[PDB]
Design an enzyme around this catalytic site. Structure first.
Site, PDB file in Angstrom:
ATOM      1  N   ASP A   8      16.485   5.487  -6.603  1.00 13.80           N
ATOM      2  CA  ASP A   8      15.096   5.912  -6.624  1.00 13.80           C
ATOM      3  C   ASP A   8      14.843   7.154  -7.474  1.00 13.80           C
ATOM      4  OD1 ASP A   8      14.420   3.943  -4.384  1.00 13.80           O
ATOM      5  OD2 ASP A   8      12.503   4.893  -4.804  1.00 13.80           O
ATOM      6  N   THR A  55       7.291  14.389 -14.103  1.00 17.00           N
ATOM      7  CA  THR A  55       6.029  14.235 -13.354  1.00 17.00           C
ATOM      8  C   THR A  55       5.049  15.389 -13.568  1.00 17.00           C
ATOM      9  OG1 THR A  55       7.083  15.257 -11.445  1.00 17.00           O
ATOM     10  CG2 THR A  55       7.046  12.842 -11.433  1.00 17.00           C
ATOM     11  N   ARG A 101      -1.022   7.869  -7.463  1.00 13.06           N
ATOM     12  CA  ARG A 101      -0.889   7.841  -8.931  1.00 13.06           C
ATOM     13  C   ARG A 101      -1.506   6.549  -9.492  1.00 13.06           C
ATOM     14  NH1 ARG A 101       0.392  12.834  -9.810  1.00 13.06           N
ATOM     15  NH2 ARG A 101       2.490  13.594  -9.196  1.00 13.06           N
ATOM     16  N   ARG A 110      13.566   5.868   1.227  1.00 11.08           N
ATOM     17  CA  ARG A 110      14.713   6.233   0.402  1.00 11.08           C
ATOM     18  C   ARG A 110      15.974   6.402   1.232  1.00 11.08           C
ATOM     19  NH1 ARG A 110      10.077   7.928  -1.279  1.00 11.08           N
ATOM     20  NH2 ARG A 110       9.476   7.559  -3.457  1.00 11.08           N
ATOM     21  N   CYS A 146       0.854  -1.174   0.000  1.00 15.16           N
ATOM     22  CA  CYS A 146       0.000   0.000   0.000  1.00 15.16           C
ATOM     23  C   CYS A 146       0.898   1.234   0.000  1.00 15.16           C
ATOM     24  CB  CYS A 146      -0.936  -0.061   1.207  1.00 15.16           C
ATOM     25  SG  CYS A 146      -2.255  -1.238   0.905  1.00 15.16           S
ATOM     26  N   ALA A 147       1.550   1.485  -1.129  1.00 16.58           N
ATOM     27  CA  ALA A 147       2.576   2.527  -1.248  1.00 16.58           C
ATOM     28  C   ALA A 147       1.966   3.914  -1.490  1.00 16.58           C
ATOM     29  CB  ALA A 147       3.478   2.207  -2.437  1.00 16.58           C
ATOM     30  N   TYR A 204       1.556 -10.437   1.396  1.00 15.88           N
ATOM     31  CA  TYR A 204       1.643 -10.540  -0.060  1.00 15.88           C
ATOM     32  C   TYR A 204       1.443 -11.950  -0.623  1.00 15.88           C
ATOM     33  CZ  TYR A 204       4.000  -6.049   0.993  1.00 15.88           C
ATOM     34  OH  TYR A 204       4.359  -4.819   1.507  1.00 15.88           O
ATOM     35  N   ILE A 246       2.975   5.930  -3.773  1.00 15.40           N
ATOM     36  CA  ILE A 246       2.804   6.057  -5.239  1.00 15.40           C
ATOM     37  C   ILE A 246       1.573   5.304  -5.731  1.00 15.40           C
ATOM     38  CG2 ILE A 246       4.314   4.122  -6.000  1.00 15.40           C
ATOM     39  CD1 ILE A 246       3.859   7.712  -7.470  1.00 15.40           C
ATOM     40  N   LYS A 300       9.530   1.605 -11.106  1.00 10.27           N
ATOM     41  CA  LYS A 300      10.939   1.815 -11.389  1.00 10.27           C
ATOM     42  C   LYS A 300      11.599   1.947 -10.023  1.00 10.27           C
ATOM     43  CE  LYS A 300      11.428   5.344 -10.293  1.00 10.27           C
ATOM     44  NZ  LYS A 300      11.378   5.877  -8.876  1.00 10.27           N
TER      45      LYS A 300
HETATM   46  N1  LIG Z   1       6.933   5.917 -11.115  1.00  9.71           N
HETATM   47  C1  LIG Z   1       7.021   6.960 -10.271  1.00  9.71           C
HETATM   48  O1  LIG Z   1       6.983   8.127 -10.629  1.00  9.71           O
HETATM   49  C2  LIG Z   1       7.218   6.785  -8.795  1.00  9.71           C
HETATM   50  C3  LIG Z   1       6.981   7.786  -7.844  1.00  9.71           C
HETATM   51  C4  LIG Z   1       7.175   7.570  -6.473  1.00  9.71           C
HETATM   52  C5  LIG Z   1       7.656   6.298  -6.154  1.00  9.71           C
HETATM   53  N2  LIG Z   1       7.879   5.335  -7.067  1.00  9.71           N
HETATM   54  C6  LIG Z   1       8.376   3.987  -6.750  1.00  9.71           C
HETATM   55  O2  LIG Z   1       7.413   3.250  -6.002  1.00  9.71           O
HETATM   56  C7  LIG Z   1       8.124   2.372  -5.127  1.00  9.71           C
HETATM   57  C8  LIG Z   1       7.671   2.757  -3.722  1.00  9.71           C
HETATM   58  O3  LIG Z   1       7.930   4.131  -3.428  1.00  9.71           O
HETATM   59  P1  LIG Z   1       6.841   4.985  -2.613  1.00  9.71           P
HETATM   60  O4  LIG Z   1       7.305   6.437  -2.599  1.00  9.71           O
HETATM   61  O5  LIG Z   1       5.374   4.892  -2.837  1.00  9.71           O
HETATM   62  O6  LIG Z   1       7.236   4.372  -1.143  1.00  9.71           O
HETATM   63  P2  LIG Z   1       6.289   4.008   0.130  1.00  9.71           P
HETATM   64  O7  LIG Z   1       5.081   4.839   0.442  1.00  9.71           O
HETATM   65  O8  LIG Z   1       7.318   3.643   1.180  1.00  9.71           O
HETATM   66  O9  LIG Z   1       5.648   2.572  -0.243  1.00  9.71           O
HETATM   67  C9  LIG Z   1       6.371   1.336  -0.309  1.00  9.71           C
HETATM   68  C10 LIG Z   1       5.352   0.289   0.180  1.00  9.71           C
HETATM   69  O10 LIG Z   1       6.106  -0.917   0.226  1.00  9.71           O
HETATM   70  C11 LIG Z   1       5.702  -1.736   1.336  1.00  9.71           C
HETATM   71  N3  LIG Z   1       6.848  -2.325   2.077  1.00  9.71           N
HETATM   72  C12 LIG Z   1       7.192  -3.617   2.193  1.00  9.71           C
HETATM   73  N4  LIG Z   1       8.302  -3.738   2.951  1.00  9.71           N
HETATM   74  C13 LIG Z   1       8.637  -2.484   3.331  1.00  9.71           C
HETATM   75  C14 LIG Z   1       9.655  -1.974   4.126  1.00  9.71           C
HETATM   76  N5  LIG Z   1      10.581  -2.799   4.675  1.00  9.71           N
HETATM   77  N6  LIG Z   1       9.660  -0.635   4.293  1.00  9.71           N
HETATM   78  C15 LIG Z   1       8.760   0.195   3.747  1.00  9.71           C
HETATM   79  N7  LIG Z   1       7.760  -0.249   2.961  1.00  9.71           N
HETATM   80  C16 LIG Z   1       7.727  -1.593   2.769  1.00  9.71           C
HETATM   81  C17 LIG Z   1       4.812  -0.843   2.193  1.00  9.71           C
HETATM   82  O11 LIG Z   1       3.462  -1.236   1.959  1.00  9.71           O
HETATM   83  P3  LIG Z   1       2.652  -2.076   3.106  1.00  9.71           P
HETATM   84  O12 LIG Z   1       3.046  -1.405   4.401  1.00  9.71           O
HETATM   85  O13 LIG Z   1       1.209  -1.766   2.839  1.00  9.71           O
HETATM   86  O14 LIG Z   1       3.141  -3.504   3.076  1.00  9.71           O
HETATM   87  C18 LIG Z   1       5.084   0.566   1.654  1.00  9.71           C
HETATM   88  O15 LIG Z   1       3.879   1.322   1.736  1.00  9.71           O
HETATM   89  C19 LIG Z   1       9.623   2.543  -5.305  1.00  9.71           C
HETATM   90  O16 LIG Z   1      10.194   1.556  -6.189  1.00  9.71           O
HETATM   91  C20 LIG Z   1       9.620   3.970  -5.873  1.00  9.71           C
HETATM   92  O17 LIG Z   1      10.844   4.223  -6.568  1.00  9.71           O
HETATM   93  C21 LIG Z   1       7.678   5.539  -8.382  1.00  9.71           C
HETATM   94  C1  LIG Z   2       5.810  19.590  -7.639  1.00  8.92           C
HETATM   95  C2  LIG Z   2       6.733  19.673  -6.442  1.00  8.92           C
HETATM   96  C3  LIG Z   2       7.101  18.562  -5.694  1.00  8.92           C
HETATM   97  N1  LIG Z   2       7.961  18.700  -4.667  1.00  8.92           N
HETATM   98  C4  LIG Z   2       8.371  17.530  -3.893  1.00  8.92           C
HETATM   99  C5  LIG Z   2       7.213  16.650  -3.419  1.00  8.92           C
HETATM  100  C6  LIG Z   2       7.810  15.262  -3.567  1.00  8.92           C
HETATM  101  O1  LIG Z   2       8.400  14.781  -2.342  1.00  8.92           O
HETATM  102  C7  LIG Z   2       8.936  15.289  -4.590  1.00  8.92           C
HETATM  103  C8  LIG Z   2       8.531  14.706  -5.956  1.00  8.92           C
HETATM  104  O2  LIG Z   2       7.219  15.151  -6.287  1.00  8.92           O
HETATM  105  P1  LIG Z   2       6.708  14.950  -7.811  1.00  8.92           P
HETATM  106  O3  LIG Z   2       7.712  15.441  -8.845  1.00  8.92           O
HETATM  107  O4  LIG Z   2       5.326  15.494  -7.835  1.00  8.92           O
HETATM  108  O5  LIG Z   2       6.810  13.360  -7.981  1.00  8.92           O
HETATM  109  P2  LIG Z   2       5.981  12.113  -7.330  1.00  8.92           P
HETATM  110  O6  LIG Z   2       5.732  12.433  -5.875  1.00  8.92           O
HETATM  111  O7  LIG Z   2       4.874  11.864  -8.326  1.00  8.92           O
HETATM  112  O8  LIG Z   2       7.080  10.984  -7.536  1.00  8.92           O
HETATM  113  C9  LIG Z   2       8.322  11.043  -6.971  1.00  8.92           C
HETATM  114  C10 LIG Z   2       8.481  10.887  -5.595  1.00  8.92           C
HETATM  115  C11 LIG Z   2       9.786  10.967  -5.117  1.00  8.92           C
HETATM  116  C12 LIG Z   2      10.852  11.191  -5.980  1.00  8.92           C
HETATM  117  C13 LIG Z   2      10.682  11.344  -7.355  1.00  8.92           C
HETATM  118  C14 LIG Z   2       9.383  11.265  -7.842  1.00  8.92           C
HETATM  119  O9  LIG Z   2       9.090  16.687  -4.811  1.00  8.92           O
HETATM  120  C15 LIG Z   2       8.465  19.902  -4.331  1.00  8.92           C
HETATM  121  O10 LIG Z   2       9.257  19.944  -3.337  1.00  8.92           O
HETATM  122  N2  LIG Z   2       8.111  21.023  -5.005  1.00  8.92           N
HETATM  123  C16 LIG Z   2       7.279  20.895  -6.070  1.00  8.92           C
HETATM  124  O11 LIG Z   2       6.995  21.924  -6.702  1.00  8.92           O
HETATM  125 CL   LIG Z   3       7.161   7.652 -14.056  1.00 11.89          CL
END
Ligand SMILES: NC(=O)c1ccc[n+]([C@@H]2O[C@H](COP(=O)([O-])OP(=O)(O)OC[C@H]3O[C@@H](n4cnc5c(N)ncnc54)[C@H](OP(=O)(O)O)[C@@H]3O)[C@@H](O)[C@H]2O)c1
Ligand SMILES: Cc1cn([C@H]2C[C@H](O)[C@@H](COP(=O)(O)OP(=O)(O)Oc3ccccc3)O2)c(=O)[nH]c1=O
Ligand SMILES: [Cl-]
Ligand SMILES: [Cl-]
Ligand code: NA
EC number: 1.1.1.384
Length: 325
Positions: A175, A253, A17, A163, A10-11, A56, A13, A95
């Site tokens: 990340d 983003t 998104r 992170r 339950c992330a 899971y 992201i 990713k």
């Molecule tokens: N594509 C994009 O733009 C984008 C943007 C932000 C993040 N991400 C990616 O999404 C992934 C998660 O990032 P996020 O920012 O959403 O992080 P986040 O809120 O920490 O979510 C990660 C989820 O993983 C689970 N988990 C399982 N083992 C864990 C552990 N030991 N510590 C923490 N969480 C654990 C938790 O879900 P449960 O507690 O419910 O098990 C946690 O909510 C990463 O690979 C990140 O790079 C991608």
């Molecule tokens: C607009 C914006 C964001 N953030 C902060 C808020 C946030 O912690 C970080 C990125 O916000 P975002 O580019 O929206 O990307 P996602 O959260 O979708 O995905 C990632 C999460 C973490 C790393 C990279 C991407 O920047 C700022 O500090 N200022 C800004 O104007």
């Molecule tokens: Cl992306």
């Protein structure tokens, strides 16, 4: 029938998104969401539908799940992708797909033997704005490309963020640096080679918090990539050409409703073009669902994820590591 999607983890992201895209997409039905804490799964299903699942493995055992989204911390991706594929589920992995190229090759081989799709969710590749930029560049708007820069930097995340844990979220290269590294492959092509980099590691938490990398094509077109989580927000790229330069913000983003603005400058003249808005999250999830539904799993996607993994490894291994203070 829509593809039935289960989410493991339950992330943030997922909440922000991915789940809203899955909920809205006609081709995908959210059938189950798993969490280490049942109460968290329930909060997610109350918002997005599906059955809450504790842990899971239980989700992967479900017959009403066709495909699993894996938004787990980067370092934990491989374990759960491997398990999902072995359970017979296609997988949309966040990713970076995983932590290194050999791991990536193994995950793709597991998928391949089962005819399953494994897709790395670089949602930004699905936003039309990049192809609109590349079309301008191919039209010669700034002449021949000489070099490229891209940056994704953010202000520090709350303490306890994934992170900051090297064996969970994996730090600023894995990340966040993966974004500008991936944009460099998208625009400069498949022959990028590492030249040098610096990674700043915070001694206290032992994690990478920022860096800068220099890559090159074999013709000497360079890419200067900056990333980090100790910074003000930057999210841009810029091309320097033989007769002009082009740059843009909000590259990785952009909001679903935000209209990109392409900036060009050349001698004595500058122009800005406003492009249409697009929901890249929705587009990425629809492309995954269509690939699963059709069975057409684009070869370019896995080849690109493998090349990306290699460059990341090359930056990790080639960089000068500086610990502070
Ligand atoms: N594509 C994009 O733009 C984008 C943007 C932000 C993040 N991400 C990616 O999404 C992934 C998660 O990032 P996020 O920012 O959403 O992080 P986040 O809120 O920490 O979510 C990660 C989820 O993983 C689970 N988990 C399982 N083992 C864990 C552990 N030991 N510590 C923490 N969480 C654990 C938790 O879900 P449960 O507690 O419910 O098990 C946690 O909510 C990463 O690979 C990140 O790079 C991608
Ligand atoms: C607009 C914006 C964001 N953030 C902060 C808020 C946030 O912690 C970080 C990125 O916000 P975002 O580019 O929206 O990307 P996602 O959260 O979708 O995905 C990632 C999460 C973490 C790393 C990279 C991407 O920047 C700022 O500090 N200022 C800004 O104007
Ligand atoms: Cl992306
Ligand atoms: Cl702007
Ligand atoms: Na190194």
């Amino acid at each position: 029938n829509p593809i039935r999607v289960g989410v493991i983890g339950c992330a943030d992201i997922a909440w922000r998104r991915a789940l809203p895209a899955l909920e809205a997409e006609p081709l995908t039905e959210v059938t189950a969401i798993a969490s280490r804490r049942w109460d968290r799964a329930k909060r997610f299903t109350e918002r997005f539908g599906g059955e809450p699942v504790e842990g899971y493995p239980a989700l992967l055992e479900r017959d009403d799940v066709d495909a699993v989204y894996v938004p787990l911390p980067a370092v934990l991706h491989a374990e759960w992708i491997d398990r999902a594929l072995r359970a017979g589920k296609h997988v949309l992995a966040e990713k970076p797909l995983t932590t290194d190229r050999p791991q990536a090759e193994r995950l793709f081989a597991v998928a391949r033997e089962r005819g399953l799709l494994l897709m790395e969710n670089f949602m930004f590749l699905h936003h039309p704005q990049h192809r609109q930029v590349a079309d301008m560049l191919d039209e010669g708007v700034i002449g021949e490309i000489r070099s490229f820069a891209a940056s994704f930097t953010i202000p520090p995340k709350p303490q306890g963020d994934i992170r900051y844990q090297a064996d969970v979220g994996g730090g600023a290269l894995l990340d966040i640096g993966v974004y500008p590294i991936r944009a460099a492959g998208l625009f400069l092509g498949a022959d990028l080679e590492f030249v040098g980099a610096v990674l700043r590691h915070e001694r206290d938490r032992d994690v990478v918090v920022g860096g800068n990398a220099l890559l090159t094509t074999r013709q000497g077109v360079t890419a200067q990539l900056t990333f980090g989580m100790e910074h003000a927000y930057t999210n841009n790229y810029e091309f320097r050409g033989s007769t002009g330069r082009l740059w843009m913000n909000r590259v990785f983003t952009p909001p679903a409703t935000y209209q990109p603005v392409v900036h060009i400058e050349r001698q004595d003249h500058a122009e800005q073009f406003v492009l249409p808005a697009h929901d890249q999250f929705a587009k990425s999830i629809r492309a995954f669902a269509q690939a699963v539904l059709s069975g057409e799993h684009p070869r370019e996607w896995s080849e690109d994820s493998l090349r990306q993994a290699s460059l990341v490894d090359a930056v990790r291994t080639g960089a000068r590591d500086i610990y502070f203070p």
